[PDB]
Design a binder for this molecule. Structure first.
Ligand SMILES: CCCCCCCC/C=C\CCCCCCCC(=O)OC[C@H](O)CO
Ligand SMILES: CCCCCCCC/C=C\CCCCCCCC(=O)OC[C@H](O)CO
Ligand SMILES: [F-]
Ligand SMILES: [F-]
Ligand code: NA
Lengths: 95, 126, 128
């Protein structure tokens, strides 16, 4: 039981990805997406999408590289994400 | 001296500094960079260079002025626990470049701000 | 409750107060010229405890929000300190002893992070 769920790549190009997930029926405050070359943590980046959003676009990627995309949900309106009680959902897309 | 008026200057000082740090975190802590706590640390770092240099040239001030503004306000304004929690969380999620950039900005910037806080007082008297 | 509630400022002030009193004594009983043991203990102890508090709150969503404002934003916010550390480190630099300066920044920087990791590990160890 994670939040969000059914994360996937809907549209993909050689240098961009469009990910989608199932926003829970109860809106969260915002999500935090972290992505990067699987293992290469000095390449990991992160951005935040509002709770109303259920899709995000990841651009500026390198071809043929295996990426890990993780989405963290923050239920708090006034606390950072490390206080969250939601297990993130993560996927992996190549290219 | 463990005087009752001493505990009253710490509590009143930390209570104010904490509140200001809290509100800074709420309104400022951005989407990828903790501007709220970094602000409280840099500012607090600059204000201690002024207070320390100021308490040096005014040894006639009472013992509660330093315990209220340095041990009280700045003691509660800046934090290390909230800094390492945030930094450790960045490492947890894998953003090592951000954690490194955040640690550096906090450490170097705090030292330099505390330096500029001393240089301003010494330049002010000369 | 909601954000900015009067009971929140109370939990922050009380926590920050008890946090500064503990930091103040520590900075007088163990703090000595050449090396500030008091300031290092307040930050290291605080760094470990916030790791514990963050792990507890994450696994106990039911707890009221004032446990976080009192224990973390309050207590651990008055216990730890970046200001006094920055001043002590800049004193070491102007006093020439660059070796102990680096030894201090690294000890309290990497020390805090490691202690936070242990705090997180301590909780993760027992709840499971
Ligand atoms: C039970 C433990 C609950 C913690 C779930 C994992 C979690 O908190 O994930 C988000 C993270 O805290 C963001 O840094
Ligand atoms: C260090 C240990 C800190 C433990 C603090 C836990 C306090 C707690 O559990 O608070 C919620 C309570 O159980 C219901 O109000
Ligand atoms: F910081
Ligand atoms: F700490
Ligand atoms: Na503090």
């Amino acid at each position: 039981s994670s939040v969000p769920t059914k994360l996937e790549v809907v549209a993909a190009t050689p240098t961009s990805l469009l990910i989608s997930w199932d926003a829970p029926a109860v809106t969260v405050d915002h999500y935090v997406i972290t992505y990067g070359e699987t293992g290469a943590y000095w390449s990991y980046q992160e951005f935040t999408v509002p709770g109303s959003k259920s899709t995000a676009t990841i651009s500026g990627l390198k071809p043929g590289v295996d990426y890990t995309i993780t989405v963290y949900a923050n239920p708090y309106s006034d606390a950072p994400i490390y206080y969250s009680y939601h297990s993130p959902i993560s996927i992996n897309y190549r290219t | 001296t463990y005087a009752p008026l001493n505990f009253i200057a710490i509590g009143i000082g930390a209570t104010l500094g904490a509140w200001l740090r809290w509100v800074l975190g709420l309104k400022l802590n951005g989407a990828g960079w903790p501007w709220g706590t970094l602000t409280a640390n840099l500012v607090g770092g600059y204000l201690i260079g002024v207070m320390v240099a100021l308490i040096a040239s005014h040894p006639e001030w009472p013992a509660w002025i330093r315990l209220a503004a340095v041990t009280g306000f700045l003691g509660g304004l800046t934090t290390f626990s909230t800094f390492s929690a945030e930094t450790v969380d960045m490492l947890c999620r894998g953003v090592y470049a951000t954690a490194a950039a955040y640690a550096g900005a906090s450490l170097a910037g705090s030292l330099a701000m505390t330096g500029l806080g001393l240089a301003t007082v010494r330049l002010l008297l000369r």
